Design a protein around this ligand. Structure first.
Ligand SMILES: Cc1cc2c(cc1C)N(C[C@H](O)[C@H](O)[C@H](O)COP(=O)(O)OP(=O)(O)OC[C@H]1O[C@@H](n3cnc4c(N)ncnc43)[C@H](O)[C@@H]1O)c1[nH]c(=O)[nH]c(=O)c1N2
Length: 458
DNA sequence: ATCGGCTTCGCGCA
DNA sequence: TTGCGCGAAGCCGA
């Protein structure tokens, strides 16, 4: 009734006599959620309530108000949603290692379930959780169509090597979601959102005139809005996606990534609705490849390379190339603070940084250019990786995500890419030029949208 | 083996 | 712009 290959037993023990607890982390949604659909089932077999617990930890100080409101507002909407299904929602504030471990005792949980995320630190918590628990601990991949550990069992070198593996399992894992059965066995935020903002308030990004840089109206948060972005994409942009996706002057991207990041929407549902949309094959194929292949190879990459954010996980050829050019003369070198405020010589580069700063979502094509000029105008790879990680995670609404580390590592160190012509500083890593951007899209339109803002920020 | 074929490249040319 | 061929380049995998 649910494909069991979505579950990995983490810790074995005695199904306690009490409620099943869904430890919610990556997939912050109440529909299309295999981990909550499993949680409700084991609850159903033992006639207990299902509760959901969410742990709010101090990592919000590492990013900004922009991500932190996007999250807390969905969770306000989420809590309403679960409670309509008789599912209470418990919000802890502290480190998951002990908050989830005491909660399991304090509530005499019968069973623990969590969703899957490949990032280092969730495995730390999990492991510290396992150490302090006695009831069983289960994990469900509710983020990938094909559960990450089943799609491939090794780091995948390239997309064309992972693509055939994935598409063989798709007939079996691409399926419809059953209906979340509300509890029969019947079992603060705002204040938590207000406290945070004032912690984050002195670090807000401000214009010269004390005005917030960020514009909070390009992406409304929530399960319900995420579905309506998915609906406008299928209605208005799926047809043109294939052809206009690399023009940053036309808003022809799905715009779905901030929601997928927080798991405010299942990518499986998107694949589902896209698959049945009558539109252009070139568009549907190009898109399915982004949301299936490139999204899930970025989980693959984080999962099988624990150092997914360091120089050391680049390919051998890439490292040998970059190191041989460590001593080449850089034509410009900017500090972190200099990129951050768009104060380089390159008005195209400055514009994309203006787009990141003020919308929280930079155009996907521009993201390659942005990051490769970072490698070109910093004093070393390591610093370039540093600066590019720190700004992608400070300011992208979709930041702090495996897709992040795996695209940074594409751009700077050639992971899941190949070797190209050898040049100074950047070695054999793929090159992108301003003149290349010019023949592809009207760069002066892009730069005009944002050049107004540069001299306004401080 | 042993060879095509590789996300998102740049550029000259028509 | 717009599509095509050619380039330079390392490695997987049937
Ligand atoms: C320098 C740099 C930095 C980042 C990223 C790339 C690069 C080169 N990415 C990946 C990608 O650029 C980004 O997901 C898209 O711009 C998302 O915008 P749309 O949702 O509109 O994508 P669009 O509608 O074009 O694609 C659909 C979905 O496919 C997936 N996808 C598309 N391109 C991908 C890519 N290059 N890598 C992985 N999955 C991809 C995403 O889930 C995306 O929402 C990333 N992604 C992210 O989610 N968060 C981040 O913080 C970053 N950071």
């Amino acid at each position: 009734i649910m494909n069991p290959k979505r579950i990995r037993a983490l810790k074995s023990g005695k199904q306690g006599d009490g409620p099943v607890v869904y430890w919610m982390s990556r997939d912050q949604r109440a529909e299309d959620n295999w981990a909550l659909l499993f949680s409700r089932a084991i609850a159903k077999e033992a006639n207990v309530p299902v509760v959901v617990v969410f742990c709010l930890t101090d990592e919000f100080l590492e990013a900004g108000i922009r991500q932190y409101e996007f999250m807390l507002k969905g969770l306000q909407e989420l809590e309403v949603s679960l409670s309509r299904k008789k599912i209470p929602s418990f919000f802890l504030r502290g480190d998951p290692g002990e908050k989830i471990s005491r909660f399991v005792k304090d509530y005499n949980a019968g069973t623990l379930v969590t969703d899957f995320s490949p990032l280092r630190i969730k495995n730390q918590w999990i492991e510290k959780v396992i150490s302090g628990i006695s009831i069983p601990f289960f994990e469900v991949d509710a983020h990938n169509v094909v559960p990450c550990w089943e799609a491939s069992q090794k780091h995948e070198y390239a997309a064309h090597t992972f693509r055939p593996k994935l598409y063989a399992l798709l007939p079996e894992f691409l399926e419809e979601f059953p209906e979340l059965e509300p509890n029969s066995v019947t079992p603060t935020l705002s204040d938590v959102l207000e406290t945070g903002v004032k912690a984050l308030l002195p670090e807000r990004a401000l214009l010269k005139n004390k005005d917030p840089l960020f514009e909070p109206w390009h992406f409304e948060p929530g399960e319900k809005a995420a579905k309506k972005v998915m609906e406008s994409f299928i209605a208005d942009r799926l047809d043109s996606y294939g052809a206009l996706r690399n023009d940053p002057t036309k808003n022809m991207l799905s715009n779905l990534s901030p929601y997928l990041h927080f798991g405010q929407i299942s990518s499986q549902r998107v694949v589902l609705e896209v698959e049945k949309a009558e539109s252009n094959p070139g568009s549907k194929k190009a898109f399915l490849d982004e949301i299936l292949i490139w999204k899930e190879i970025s989980d693959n990459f984080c999962y099988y390379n624990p150092g997914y954010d360091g120089f050391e996980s680049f390919p051998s050829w890439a490292k040998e190339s970059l190191n041989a050019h460590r001593n080449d003369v850089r034509s410009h070198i900017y500090t972190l603070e200099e990129f951050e405020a768009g104060k380089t010589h390159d008005p195209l580069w400055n514009a994309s940084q203006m787009e990141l700063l003020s919308t929280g979502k930079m155009h996907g094509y521009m993201r390659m250019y942005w990051a490769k000029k970072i490698l070109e105008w910093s004093e070393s790879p390591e610093k370039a990786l540093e600066i590019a990680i720190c700004l992608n995670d400070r300011y992208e609404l979709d930041g702090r995500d495996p897709n992040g580390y795996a695209g940074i590592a594409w751009s700077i160190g050639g992971v899941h890419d190949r070797a190209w012509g050898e040049r100074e500083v950047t070695g054999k890593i793929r090159y992108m030029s301003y003149e290349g951007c010019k023949r592809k899209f009207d760069v002066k339109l892009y730069i005009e949208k944002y050049s107004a803002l540069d001299k306004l920020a401080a």
